[PDB]
Structures are given as C-alpha cells and as structure tokens.
Ligand binder design. Sequence first.
Ligand code: LSU
Ligand code: MG
Ligand code: ZN
Length: 832
Amino acid sequence: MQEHYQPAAIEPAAQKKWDDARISNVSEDASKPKYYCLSMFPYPSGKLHMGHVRNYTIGDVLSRFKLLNGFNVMQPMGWDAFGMPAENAAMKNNVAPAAWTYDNIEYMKTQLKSLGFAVDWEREVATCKPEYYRWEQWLFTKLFEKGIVYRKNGTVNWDPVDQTVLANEQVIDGRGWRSGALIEKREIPMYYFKITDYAEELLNDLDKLEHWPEQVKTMQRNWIGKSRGMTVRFAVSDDSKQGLEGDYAKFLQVYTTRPDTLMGATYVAVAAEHPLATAAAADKPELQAFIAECKAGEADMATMEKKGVPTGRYVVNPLNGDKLEVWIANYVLWGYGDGAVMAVPAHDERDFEFAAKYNLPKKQVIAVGDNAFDANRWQEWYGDKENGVLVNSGDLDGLDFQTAFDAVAAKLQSQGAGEPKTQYRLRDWGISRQRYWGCPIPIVHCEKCGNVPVPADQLPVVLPENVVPDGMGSPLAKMPEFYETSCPCCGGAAKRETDTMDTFIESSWYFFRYMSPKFSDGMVSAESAKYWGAVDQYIGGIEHAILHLLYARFFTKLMRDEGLVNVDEPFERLLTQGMVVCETYYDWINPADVELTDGLPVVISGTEKMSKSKNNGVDPQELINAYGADTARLFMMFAAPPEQSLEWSDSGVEGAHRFLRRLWRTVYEYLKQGGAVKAFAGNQDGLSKELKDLRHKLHSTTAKVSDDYGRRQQFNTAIAAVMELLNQYDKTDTGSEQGRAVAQEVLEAAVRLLWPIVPHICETLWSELNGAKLWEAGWPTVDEAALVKSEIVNGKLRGKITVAADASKADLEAAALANEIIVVPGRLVNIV
Ligand SMILES: CC(C)C[C@H](N)C(=O)NS(=O)(=O)OC[C@H]1O[C@@H](n2ccc(=O)[nH]c2=O)[C@H](O)[C@@H]1O
Ligand SMILES: [Mg+2]
Ligand SMILES: [Zn+2]
C-alpha cells in the first residue's frame, strides 16, 4: 500500500473500476429490489456550479447507501436543454443554441464523471434531441384530440420596438427591458393544458404524500387555491338599470367564501370591465378615467394601493333588503369568475382598509367570545372563521360558520338568489412560447381544415438546429422552409405552428423517459414503467416546489389516464437541499482570484448565495483540481445538514482533506503493523473490556449511520459518528491477536459506512483491507450482542443481587424487595 493519500491518482482509477464493473448500469432486474433515486437534472448552461455538486452528491449518498443494502439502484442524469440560456448565448456570441448546448453537455458531463457519482450514463437524455421531444409532441396531439389541450386567445406583452413578445419578467414598469418602449397587450391564439379539470385530483392526492415536507404540500394547496363558497346575486335596483341589458340588467352576481357574513355587507365592488362599470361611466368621465387607469396597470395585488370610485348605482342584498352602492375597484379582476365581489369591512381586512380610506360603513355580524369590537381598528379575530358565531343576523343569530353557510345556502336557493360553488385560484397552463429554442408545437394550420394535429407517424416535427436567433422575433416565423408544409387532412398547402412549448413540458415527464430512454414506440415502455414504478426519492431546490412539481404530478396523471404508467404520483420522497453561499469581493471579483487578507487588494464584501450576479460561485473544477472529488463531497456533506445553507469555507475544505489523509493514514499504519486478518465476528465473551467497548462503539456507530442515511437523511452527523469511532479506536490498544481482529472489524465497517460520502478513498482502502467485492460484502450489520453491557435491611447487610446495567431505580428496589427503600445505583439498595 502506498503510504500517502493521492486523490488525483486514486480517484480516476476507482471510477474506471466502477465503470468497468458496470455497477451503476442497471437493467429491469426482477431478481433485485428496485430503488429509483433522482436528482433534478440541470440546464446545460456551461459548467457545474458548487450548488450542482451539493444537490448531486446528496443524491449519490442515498443511491450508494441503497446499493450497499442490495437494491437495484437507478440514478439517472440528463440535460434540461431547451430554453432561453441558449438563446441569449446565441445572441451574445453569434452561435447556434444547439451547438452551444452540446458543448456545455460535454463539459458538464465530464465534470459530473470526475466527481464519481454512481450514475447510469446509459440512460442519459438530452431534451433538445428529437429522440426525446417527439413523445411530448405525441402526447400533445393525443390530448389535443381529447380537448385536454386546446387553443384560444390569450393576452401577451408586445414590445413594439424589439418586435417580440415579452414575459412579465422583462416588462419593467410597463416597458420593454431592452427598449423601454411602452408595452402593448395583444390577443393572440395560444395553446393551453386544461389543468383545471384535474385541480381536485391534484389537491387531494397530496394527502397520499406522507413522505413530503409539509410546507411543500402547503405551497401546492395554496397555489391550487381551492375554496368552497357561495354564488350570490343582488338584484339591480329600479333606478340603476340605465344602459344595462340581459341578465346584467337584472342582478349583480358575486362569489364569496364568507356567505355567513352576507348580512354585514356594506357595499359591492366590480371590475373596471364589468358592464355596470361601463354603463355608469357614460355621463361620468370621472369613472371613465378610473376605468382607464385600471386596465393600464395576484402578483402585485398584495403590494398595490387599493382604490375605488362610487357609481351612483345600487343593488339589493337578497337577505336583508339593504340597498348598497356599487364601486369600481382596482382590486377586482375581470376573469376570476363573476368579476364582482361583495364587501364586509367588519370581517375582511382588505375591505376594512378600503372602507377606512373612504369612510364606508362597517357592520359587525360575527362575534368571537367576549372580544371587544372597535370599528376604528382592525384585529385578527374579526376574520375568525372557526370560533365565531353570528351577530345581528336575525334568523341566523347564534350559528357558527358551517351552519350559517348551510342556512344561507338554503335561503338563497329557496329565493333563487344564489347557490354553493367551488372555485380555484388555479388557471389553465399556457404552453405557447414565441421563442426559437424549444419543442415545436405539432399543429398545422390549414385554411380549409383549421388547426390540425400532426399524425403520429409524422412525429417529430424537427426543430431546425441550423439557426442563430437575434432577438427580433422567433426565426421560425421567418423560415418558410420550416413553416410551409401540406395539410395532413386534405393535402393542400398549409403552415406549421411556429410557437414552441413551455420548457417546463420537458421536465414534466423526464423521470419516466429515464426508465426506457431508447424506447421508440412510446413515451415509456410498459415493461419499464411496471418495473420502476415511481421515483422513490427526489432531490432538488425549493424554487421548483410549486410549478415544476405540480406540472410533473399533472403529467403523471395524464400519462396514467393514457395507460402509459400505473402510478398516481411521480415522487414518493422529496428532499430540498439548501443553497451554497459564499463571500463576495469588489466590478465584482470571483473568490478564486482575490488578494485574500492584482496589486492593490479588493473589498471583502458580504456573503450570499453563489450566483453570477455578484460573481461569487466557486468553480468545482478548481476545487477538484486542488483537492479531488472526495474532499469536495466530504466538505459539503459535513458542513451542514443538507437542508441548511452551506457556507463556503477554505478551512472547511482543508479540514475535509486532512480527515481523508487521516483515514488513509489509519489504514496504512494498521496494515504496516502486521497485514490484514479476519475481522472479529461471533461471541465476544473473553474479549477485554477495552475491546468490548470498542465493539460497542462500532455497532452503535453502524446503527446511527444507518438511521442518519436511511431515516433522518442527515449526513453531517453520520460523518461525525464515524469520526467518534475512529477517535475511540485511536485510544484503544489493538496490538494483540484479538485486538488486531477487532481493529480489522472497525476499519472494515468505517470504510463501508463512509463509502456513500467518499467512495474513491473507501473503495481503495477497502481492497487493501479485504479481498471481496465491497458491494457484495454490503452494508455493515449491527451486532446486537456487542451492544449489551455487563451486569453490575435497615443497616446491616443481608444479601446481594445481580443487576442489569440498564436497571432503573424501580428494578433495584424490586430485586431488593425479593432477596432473602433508599437506592444508590451500582452500590447499595437499603430498605429501612
Ligand atoms: C427539474 C427541472 C425543472 C430542473 C431544472 N433543469 C433546473 O432547475 N436546473 S438547474 O441546473 O438550475 O438546477 C438543477 C438542480 O441543481 C440545484 N442547484 C443548481 C444550481 C445552484 O446554484 N444550486 C442548486 O442547488 C437546483 O436547485 C436544482 O435542484
Ligand atoms: Mg402510502
Ligand atoms: Zn386541410
């Protein structure tokens, strides 16, 4: 054995060994229990970041842990290759997004390989490849025919100068990011997934995810935003009919989730586009100007100032006769149902602020205990939906929320003035992107037949990769060699859709493609979907906790309903790794290039998440080059729990390295002192106290690491536990024949316990210790016998009893009360 730890030498040799044994290239082996461990696949945007490495090391520790326990582990990787990063790289550097993408894939994959993750590179996918996206085109066509995907006009932000559709992330104060020109709102036909048809399924199925973080489930519940409420109609008054036609002449309709407060309404509010708004804004230009301000302006709703103007029109509350004025209010949106709401200032906080601004009335209709009500100050309990009881509500006084709900539902229904209704904040999923580098939408536009889907055997619609976009509209709409085609229905001349898909589509089903990424007759082969089932463990950042996860669960249910898979939920367990943060320097300098206290130094600034913004993300390549993959993986698993933020630390990197030198040194000095022997096993009576204690430390450590890997998923404490065993080992004379056998038992366990964290050094040290295959020896066992510890009358002594080392004060006093009560354990039990 070489005396000194050389990671730059041991690490490539170990990866070659693993690659040559194909331990990570798995099949659908029915003679082994499957384990599907998945880390969120990256955008190939150039080079791996330190955050990447943390995410993917975590996935690797869990995959390697399951593999040592005999599982058939699939840990796939791949490239979420479509989207804007490549388009800007095309604009900025005069190159095709495809070739820029494959260049990045090559570099990053080599980076990922050098970290030694146990990945099935035979299941790699690149989502920008026709091989992949043809199947999401296929699914699009099948759902389009069912109406699950549909086409209708939607609003986009048009920049008149750049001549391109803008996302709201690029419209700043109403103007184009790279232009400042005033943005126009234009109607254009776009494609949508009817995700609202699955809202109830997507909500209730969260209850099945017992192994998801509760906050992630809460974020999804709040996004779907289900509410059970009441449709309520207020008959338009006799004096307020001018210009009103149809049903709008008859009643103002409203959705409320608090119909138990209907007797406390003091006004109503309609959107600027509501017919009662535009009808009262005829002889009243003051309202015409407010209506103008509104369509000029959920994201900003909380932050914005709530404004309204009176209307002079009136409606009648169907429950208590009251005639209440309508208002036009900027907070009422035209499209979220009725476009009109009631207002109960005494029990809704926004209605309170609105009514306090304009001095509008507020009427208590709910009291909570003896809580004092004061109309001039809002208190949290005004909105209490659980401990309130109805006040000033005549026939409803004394009821609680649900009974009043059911009562007003019965009253309104019996008078025809309302009915219960379920609403959702969830909107349909808009697919269309007016950009180049993304999956083409498989629709052909024909003047006779309409918009028609591309037949299955004509898929894929191939995206031309010989394209350099220039931010002046999508190049596809200027490429007749792409959009000119024939109609698949009638054969006449026709045009391809030139919009591309939301790149969330690719990441909504890639976990299924991984099961059979060369299947050519469908999204995923039946045989593979049956074997792998669902992802047992998913690891990714919290920024994807809402949209990506909801889209992925939605696609899972769509694919199941198509008979392609037989699971309801894609991800069983979910782990959210914390960010990696790092000091900043300064414009801004990368930390690997600084005068750490060119010539005059820089300013040591603040610590924040590694990013391009402040140029503070350390290249994991400089870290691998300088210390090796195992030091990188060890540092990140040791510094903090995986969920906590990780602070970049030079001394922490050094400390991980020195610990690996120590592990190396410990094994060498053991084999220097007499070579390998058979590890201690079996009954341990006759072993010395010192060796019994070391074996106790050993098997306690195996139990704790197994729990930390398996149940708690806290790897930093697992490493600390293995450090304590080594410290104990260092304080133990293991020179005797029995001592050498226990020493071999300790080092053989420690090397396997750490193998998921630092597999290169542990693989190398293991083969110096033992001649078997490490993955066939498997995860260390807990020897329960090693955990059992040895056993330890009014004055004059009268007997003696054998006690368990874990016997409580009640057991000493019990055994004392049985031999032929003050108790000092280990010494005497004295019965007065
Ligand atoms: C499933 C897809 C929608 C994922 C998508 N390709 C993506 O986020 N791609 S990504 O490449 O941006 O990130 C891939 C994963 O790596 C983590 N990561 C990445 C960079 C960093 O600085 N910090 C950090 O933690 C990040 O949370 C995520 O889980
Ligand atoms: Mg269950
Ligand atoms: Zn046609």
